[PDB]
Amino acid sequence: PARITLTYKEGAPITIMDNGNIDTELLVGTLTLGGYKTGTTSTSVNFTDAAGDPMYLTFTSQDGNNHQFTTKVIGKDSRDFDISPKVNGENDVVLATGSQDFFVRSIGSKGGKLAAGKYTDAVTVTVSNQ
């Protein structure tokens, strides 16, 4: 019987700019989703977190001062066309056979100057029509 797996490969450390924000389109990490049924499409995949911001996964500082930044989740099909799974309910392509990489790409600070350090997000994926 089918079992969904979600693993992750951290990307490079992210540099905070002089103005306290981060650049866009940095590879923050790679999510690898596996175990879904043949034929599963991207609208059947929904990555969610606590912040629950539609379209974005939010990372939050561990220092109790609540700096955050947002990211988007985009993969690639074998034409190199973008695959946009739902993130907190909002984005349609067939996933690759067996498993699919999804790149977590930086957007920016949610507001204010970011303090260097570690930032976390606990992510859930729900895969429907299985």
């Binding site: 450390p13 220092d63 303090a115 260097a116 350090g117 570690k118």
Partner: protein, 206 residues
């Protein structure tokens, strides 16, 4: 106006003791080429190798330096402190007046913190454990942890004090500006391993 600038990709290096090496990026932010001269100094201001020790970095370009530990012996119950200094060397270049011609060069220096794997946790886990006394006209921080407590903000009786690190399992004595008589609250924040200012702690002096 003459302009100079050197950027190192981190503000400190946490060097895991006995690791083969770490990479750090350097960036020439200027419009002319420079020579990048990189040197390590001990904690006193004067085993680790930086490769390359000298190389040309063109305008607006970035390259990586490798910092490698080749042998040497370090204590295992505390961090050790060295300094990596990255200097940007720019290109070189009336019968009655004194004409004055000055060239500069920036030597950007960052802490190289040698950290035994034997230590558990990280500095932000212990930042609250600093304690404070006033003695011989100075404010004294005692750091019982095995980490350098790299203070980035310090305030005593509501007045800023220029920060400095507190060495592991030891102390540091800060000079007091005038008019601090009967002051009680010390608030501080350390700088974390990634260079960010950590959360604020407060206590009264003994």
């Amino acid at each position: 106006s003459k302009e100079y600038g050197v950027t190192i990709g981190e503000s400190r290096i946490i060097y895991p003791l006995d690791a083969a090496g770490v990479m750090v990026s350097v960036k020439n932010t200027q419009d002319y080429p420079v020579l990048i001269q990189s040197r390590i100094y001990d904690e006193n201001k004067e085993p680790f190798v930086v490769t390359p020790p000298l190389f040309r970095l063109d305008a607006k370009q970035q390259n990586s330096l490798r910092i490698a530990q080749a042998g040497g012996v370090f204590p295992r119950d505390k961090e050790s402190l060295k300094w990596l200094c990255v200097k940007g060397i720019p290109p070189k270049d009336p019968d009655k007046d004194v004409g004055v011609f000055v060239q500069f060069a920036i030597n950007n220096c960052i802490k190289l913190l040698v950290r035994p794997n034997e230590l558990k946790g990280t500095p932000i886990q212990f930042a609250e454990n600093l304690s404070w006394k006033v003695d011989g006209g100075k404010l004294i921080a005692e750091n019982p942890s095995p980490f350098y407590m790299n203070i980035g903000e310090l305030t005593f009786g509501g007045k800023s004090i220029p920060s400095h690190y507190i060495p592991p399992k030891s102390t540091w004595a800060f000079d007091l500006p005038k008019g601090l008589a009967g002051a009680r609250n010390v608030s501080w924040r350390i700088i974390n391993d990634q260079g960010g200012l950590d959360r604020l702690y407060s206590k009264n002096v003994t």
